[PDB]
Design an enzyme around this catalytic site. Structure first.
Site, PDB file in Angstrom:
ATOM      1  N   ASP A 160       0.815  -1.217   0.000  1.00  0.00           N
ATOM      2  CA  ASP A 160       0.000   0.000   0.000  1.00  0.00           C
ATOM      3  C   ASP A 160       0.852   1.272   0.000  1.00  0.00           C
ATOM      4  O   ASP A 160       0.365   2.367   0.319  1.00  0.00           O
ATOM      5  CB  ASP A 160      -1.027  -0.009   1.146  1.00  0.00           C
ATOM      6  CG  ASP A 160      -0.397  -0.297   2.500  1.00  0.00           C
ATOM      7  OD1 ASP A 160       0.812  -0.009   2.684  1.00  0.00           O
ATOM      8  OD2 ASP A 160      -1.127  -0.743   3.409  1.00  0.00           O
ATOM      9  N   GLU A 185       0.971  -6.087   6.458  1.00  0.00           N
ATOM     10  CA  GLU A 185       2.412  -5.894   6.507  1.00  0.00           C
ATOM     11  C   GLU A 185       3.103  -7.029   5.766  1.00  0.00           C
ATOM     12  O   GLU A 185       2.660  -8.181   5.820  1.00  0.00           O
ATOM     13  CB  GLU A 185       2.897  -5.846   7.953  1.00  0.00           C
ATOM     14  CG  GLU A 185       3.888  -4.741   8.207  1.00  0.00           C
ATOM     15  CD  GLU A 185       3.311  -3.374   7.874  1.00  0.00           C
ATOM     16  OE1 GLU A 185       3.796  -2.731   6.920  1.00  0.00           O
ATOM     17  OE2 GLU A 185       2.305  -2.989   8.506  1.00  0.00           O
ATOM     18  N   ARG A 224       4.174  11.410   3.664  1.00  0.00           N
ATOM     19  CA  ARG A 224       3.793  10.650   2.478  1.00  0.00           C
ATOM     20  C   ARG A 224       2.559  11.280   1.835  1.00  0.00           C
ATOM     21  O   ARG A 224       1.582  11.586   2.531  1.00  0.00           O
ATOM     22  CB  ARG A 224       3.527   9.162   2.808  1.00  0.00           C
ATOM     23  CG  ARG A 224       4.743   8.437   3.401  1.00  0.00           C
ATOM     24  CD  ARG A 224       4.439   6.994   3.824  1.00  0.00           C
ATOM     25  NE  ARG A 224       3.362   6.901   4.801  1.00  0.00           N
ATOM     26  CZ  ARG A 224       2.832   5.761   5.231  1.00  0.00           C
ATOM     27  NH1 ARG A 224       3.387   4.592   4.897  1.00  0.00           N
ATOM     28  NH2 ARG A 224       1.791   5.788   6.054  1.00  0.00           N
TER      29      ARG A 224
HETATM   30  C1  LIG Z   1      -4.194   5.580   4.391  1.00  0.00           C
HETATM   31  C2  LIG Z   1      -3.701   6.521   5.469  1.00  0.00           C
HETATM   32  C3  LIG Z   1      -2.708   6.199   6.335  1.00  0.00           C
HETATM   33  N1  LIG Z   1      -2.298   7.117   7.283  1.00  0.00           N
HETATM   34  C4  LIG Z   1      -1.230   6.782   8.238  1.00  0.00           C
HETATM   35  C5  LIG Z   1      -1.859   6.158   9.493  1.00  0.00           C
HETATM   36  C6  LIG Z   1      -0.767   5.168   9.964  1.00  0.00           C
HETATM   37  O1  LIG Z   1       0.129   5.935  10.766  1.00  0.00           O
HETATM   38  P1  LIG Z   1       0.304   5.282  12.227  1.00  0.00           P
HETATM   39  O2  LIG Z   1       1.187   3.957  12.069  1.00  0.00           O
HETATM   40  O3  LIG Z   1       1.107   6.404  13.072  1.00  0.00           O
HETATM   41  O4  LIG Z   1      -0.971   4.977  12.884  1.00  0.00           O
HETATM   42  C7  LIG Z   1      -0.010   4.806   8.665  1.00  0.00           C
HETATM   43  C8  LIG Z   1      -0.218   3.352   8.219  1.00  0.00           C
HETATM   44  O5  LIG Z   1       0.284   3.247   6.894  1.00  0.00           O
HETATM   45  P2  LIG Z   1       1.633   2.370   6.794  1.00  0.00           P
HETATM   46  O6  LIG Z   1       1.408   1.127   7.548  1.00  0.00           O
HETATM   47  O7  LIG Z   1       2.005   2.094   5.254  1.00  0.00           O
HETATM   48  O8  LIG Z   1       2.872   3.165   7.461  1.00  0.00           O
HETATM   49  O9  LIG Z   1      -0.433   5.752   7.651  1.00  0.00           O
HETATM   50  C9  LIG Z   1      -2.903   8.312   7.402  1.00  0.00           C
HETATM   51  O10 LIG Z   1      -2.509   9.109   8.247  1.00  0.00           O
HETATM   52  N2  LIG Z   1      -3.906   8.652   6.573  1.00  0.00           N
HETATM   53  C10 LIG Z   1      -4.321   7.783   5.605  1.00  0.00           C
HETATM   54  O11 LIG Z   1      -5.226   8.079   4.853  1.00  0.00           O
HETATM   55 CA   LIG Z   2       2.668   0.361   3.863  1.00  0.00          CA
HETATM   56 CA   LIG Z   3      -0.449  -1.781   5.495  1.00  0.00          CA
END
Ligand SMILES: Cc1cn([C@H]2C[C@H](OP(=O)(O)O)[C@@H](COP(=O)(O)O)O2)c(=O)[nH]c1=O
Ligand SMILES: [Ca+2]
Ligand SMILES: [Ca+2]
EC number: 3.1.31.1
Length: 129
Positions: free
Chosen positions: A15, A37, A75
């Site tokens: 993702d 993951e 990101r």
């Molecule tokens: C899809 C998405 C993810 N995220 C953040 C939340 C998660 O951060 P936290 O881990 O601090 O909770 C993280 C998970 O994506 P990843 O697992 O690829 O890093 O991306 C957003 O903030 N907004 C979004 O729309």
């Molecule tokens: Ca990811």
């Molecule tokens: Ca994920």
């Protein structure tokens, strides 16, 4: 919403993908989905699916929603298309991602992705086995 051209730098996981966007390297996190993951069941399958989709695309487009464009890690948050096919939806439809992180600003394609998830669920695909 509008589609903006971008080019691949590197696949990261199910993702998450690194693109060149407006001449800058930027990691993008897919809107509205969560692939397992890599170290979880179906994680490798999700990573491979996204990698194949972006590496084989002649054209990649980035589509921001109407809410926040970047997450807390810097990101970009977008829908990503590979030759006109939305990667977010494709993962969902194959049961390699589930609808997730649904926020009010950034939910333009929610119903479409839930539709995809329901079909994957019906077919007991991958995550829904
Ligand atoms: C899809 C998405 C993810 N995220 C953040 C939340 C998660 O951060 P936290 O881990 O601090 O909770 C993280 C998970 O994506 P990843 O697992 O690829 O890093 O991306 C957003 O903030 N907004 C979004 O729309
Ligand atoms: Ca990811
Ligand atoms: Ca994920």
């Amino acid at each position: 919403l509008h589609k903006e051209p971008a080019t691949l730098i590197k696949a990261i996981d199910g993702d998450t993908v690194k693109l060149m966007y407006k001449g800058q390297p930027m990691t993008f996190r897919l809107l509205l989905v969560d692939t397992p993951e890599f170290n979880e069941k179906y994680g490798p399958e999700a990573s491979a699916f996204t990698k194949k989709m972006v590496e084989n695309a002649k054209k990649i487009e980035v589509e921001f929603d109407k809410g926040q464009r970047t997450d807390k890690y810097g990101r970009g948050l977008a829908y990503i298309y590979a030759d006109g096919k939305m990667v977010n939806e494709a993962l969902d439809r194959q049961g390699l991602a589930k609808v997730a992180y649904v926020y009010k600003g950034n939910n333009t394609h929610e119903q479409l992705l839930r539709k995809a998830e329901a079909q994957a669920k019906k077919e007991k695909l991958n995550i829904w086995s």
